[PDB]
Design an enzyme around this catalytic site. Structure first.
Site, PDB file in Angstrom:
ATOM      1  N   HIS A 186      26.382   7.612  10.640  1.00 44.47           N
ATOM      2  CA  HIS A 186      27.270   8.319  11.555  1.00 44.47           C
ATOM      3  C   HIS A 186      28.154   9.362  10.857  1.00 44.47           C
ATOM      4  CE1 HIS A 186      29.809   8.357  15.307  1.00 44.47           C
ATOM      5  NE2 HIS A 186      30.734   8.734  14.428  1.00 44.47           N
ATOM      6  N   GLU A 187      28.842   8.975   9.768  1.00 45.16           N
ATOM      7  CA  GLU A 187      29.735   9.861   9.005  1.00 45.16           C
ATOM      8  C   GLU A 187      28.962  11.024   8.376  1.00 45.16           C
ATOM      9  OE1 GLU A 187      32.576   9.565  10.083  1.00 45.16           O
ATOM     10  OE2 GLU A 187      32.456   7.446  10.662  1.00 45.16           O
ATOM     11  N   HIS A 190      28.077  13.505  11.103  1.00 42.56           N
ATOM     12  CA  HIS A 190      29.119  14.515  11.324  1.00 42.56           C
ATOM     13  C   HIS A 190      29.026  15.569  10.221  1.00 42.56           C
ATOM     14  CE1 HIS A 190      31.379  12.872  14.587  1.00 42.56           C
ATOM     15  NE2 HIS A 190      31.671  11.721  13.972  1.00 42.56           N
ATOM     16  N   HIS A 196      29.900  13.729  18.588  1.00 39.06           N
ATOM     17  CA  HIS A 196      29.600  12.482  19.249  1.00 39.06           C
ATOM     18  C   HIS A 196      28.735  12.693  20.482  1.00 39.06           C
ATOM     19  CE1 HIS A 196      33.356  10.497  17.279  1.00 39.06           C
ATOM     20  NE2 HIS A 196      32.289  10.279  16.509  1.00 39.06           N
TER      21      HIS A 196
HETATM   22  C1  LIG Z   1      30.376   3.890  13.127  1.00 37.25           C
HETATM   23  C2  LIG Z   1      31.355   4.275  14.246  1.00 37.25           C
HETATM   24  C3  LIG Z   1      30.511   4.856  15.374  1.00 37.25           C
HETATM   25  C4  LIG Z   1      32.387   5.256  13.576  1.00 37.25           C
HETATM   26  C5  LIG Z   1      33.576   5.396  14.540  1.00 37.25           C
HETATM   27  C6  LIG Z   1      34.620   6.344  13.940  1.00 37.25           C
HETATM   28  C7  LIG Z   1      34.186   7.692  14.020  1.00 37.25           C
HETATM   29  O1  LIG Z   1      33.755   8.176  15.062  1.00 37.25           O
HETATM   30  N1  LIG Z   1      34.276   8.249  12.811  1.00 37.25           N
HETATM   31  O2  LIG Z   1      33.259   9.186  12.735  1.00 37.25           O
HETATM   32  C8  LIG Z   1      34.452   4.131  14.783  1.00 37.25           C
HETATM   33  O3  LIG Z   1      35.006   3.608  13.835  1.00 37.25           O
HETATM   34  N2  LIG Z   1      34.566   3.713  16.096  1.00 37.25           N
HETATM   35  C9  LIG Z   1      35.392   2.566  16.488  1.00 37.25           C
HETATM   36  C10 LIG Z   1      34.469   1.419  16.958  1.00 37.25           C
HETATM   37  O4  LIG Z   1      33.577   1.580  17.806  1.00 37.25           O
HETATM   38  N3  LIG Z   1      34.736   0.220  16.336  1.00 37.25           N
HETATM   39  C11 LIG Z   1      34.012  -1.015  16.624  1.00 37.25           C
HETATM   40  C12 LIG Z   1      33.487  -1.678  15.338  1.00 37.25           C
HETATM   41  C13 LIG Z   1      35.144  -1.874  17.172  1.00 37.25           C
HETATM   42  O5  LIG Z   1      36.020  -2.216  16.403  1.00 37.25           O
HETATM   43  N4  LIG Z   1      35.118  -2.230  18.524  1.00 37.25           N
HETATM   44  C14 LIG Z   1      36.187  -3.066  19.094  1.00 37.25           C
HETATM   45  C15 LIG Z   1      36.448  -2.850  20.583  1.00 37.25           C
HETATM   46  N5  LIG Z   1      37.870  -2.540  20.798  1.00 37.25           N
HETATM   47  C16 LIG Z   1      36.501   3.019  17.507  1.00 37.25           C
HETATM   48  C17 LIG Z   1      37.484   4.053  16.822  1.00 37.25           C
HETATM   49  C18 LIG Z   1      35.863   3.639  18.797  1.00 37.25           C
HETATM   50  C19 LIG Z   1      37.302   1.780  17.921  1.00 37.25           C
HETATM   51 ZN   LIG Z   2      32.462   9.876  14.596  1.00 39.95          ZN
END
Ligand SMILES: CC(C)C[C@H](CC(=O)NO)C(=O)N[C@H](C(=O)N[C@@H](C)C(=O)NCCN)C(C)(C)C
Ligand SMILES: [Zn+2]
Length: 255
Positions: A186-187, A190, A196
């Site tokens: 994913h990183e 980007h 996204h």
């Molecule tokens: C690998 C993922 C797709 C990276 C993104 C961060 C991002 O978009 N950096 O490029 C992330 O950490 N997403 C989190 C995420 O989906 N975390 C999961 C592991 C989570 O903790 N879900 C818990 C539900 N509240 C957010 C910020 C949306 C909470």
């Molecule tokens: Zn991202």
């Protein structure tokens, strides 16, 4: 596709937290983890046809792994991405993710100018489930593959936006390797230019019975669904706009 210019060479940095927690205080354990992770991420990239035809075989390879075995000692008020304390709140397990990426890019500037990408691997619990961050593919934002200078008015020098970071800690536990692979994918996604995947385009954000989400979906994917380890057509369109021009700029031959 130019086989002489199809690989984005990486400077991989493991901070003291990653070394201690993921590498168990051992260099071989630290490097093996990172070598295998990049190779599996490379398989996703190398197998992707960016134009849905023959424009494939574009990937990543580690040029160097820097292993920071201990915290970076700092003067009062001075900061460094590898310092012991989290910034801005030393009471929290992690840094603010945005400030950590800026700091890493600042401290690694000289090294980053000589590589396609620099990526930091850390082990810290970012607030609200955040697992990583990268420059590029953000909707006045810039960065990603091939060093692009940014004059830091605060830093008083040029920094390069060819950076990203991955944490292998979330909600007080080490994430699964299948999960870590997808953070880095994913990183770097980007970095390669993808934004996204939007809910509004079903082709780029399918339902669970249709293979699930693609790697650029904003909510984290645990590689259990079919699409999880693939780039959506949206990601392919975005990456393909600049992939060839960036490849000519800083990509090398697969070693
Ligand atoms: C690998 C993922 C797709 C990276 C993104 C961060 C991002 O978009 N950096 O490029 C992330 O950490 N997403 C989190 C995420 O989906 N975390 C999961 C592991 C989570 O903790 N879900 C818990 C539900 N509240 C957010 C910020 C949306 C909470
Ligand atoms: Zn991202």
């Amino acid at each position: 596709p130019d086989p002489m210019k199809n690989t984005c060479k990486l400077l991989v940095v493991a901070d003291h937290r990653f070394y201690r927690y993921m590498g168990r205080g051992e260099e071989s354990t630290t490097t093996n983890y990172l070598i295998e992770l990049i190779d599996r991420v490379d398989d996703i990239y190398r197998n992707t046809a960016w134009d849905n035809a023959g424009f494939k075989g574009y990937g990543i390879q580690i040029e160097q792994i820097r292993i920071l075995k201990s915290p970076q000692e700092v003067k009062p008020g001075e900061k460094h991405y590898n310092m012991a304390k989290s910034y801005p709140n030393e009471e929290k397990d992690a840094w603010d993710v945005k400030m950590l990426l800026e700091q890493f890019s600042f401290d690694i500037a000289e090294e980053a100018s000589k590589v396609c990408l620099a990526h930091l691997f850390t082990y810290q619990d970012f607030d609200m489930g955040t697992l990583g961050l990268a420059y590029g593919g953000s909707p006045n934002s810039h960065g990603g593959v091939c060093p692009k200078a940014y004059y830091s008015p605060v830093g008083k020098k040029n920094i390069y936006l060819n950076s990203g970071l991955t944490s292998t800690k979330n909600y007080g536990k080490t994430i699964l390797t299948k999960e870590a692979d997808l953070v880095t994918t994913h990183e770097l996604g980007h970095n390669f230019g993808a934004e996204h995947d939007p809910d509004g385009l079903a082709e780029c954000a399918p339902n669970e019975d249709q293979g699930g989400k693609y790697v650029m979906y904003p909510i984290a994917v645990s590689g259990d669904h079919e699409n999880n380890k693939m780039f959506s057509q949206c990601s392919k369109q975005s990456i393909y706009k600049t992939i060839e021009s960036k490849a000519q700029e800083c990509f090398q031959e697969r070693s």
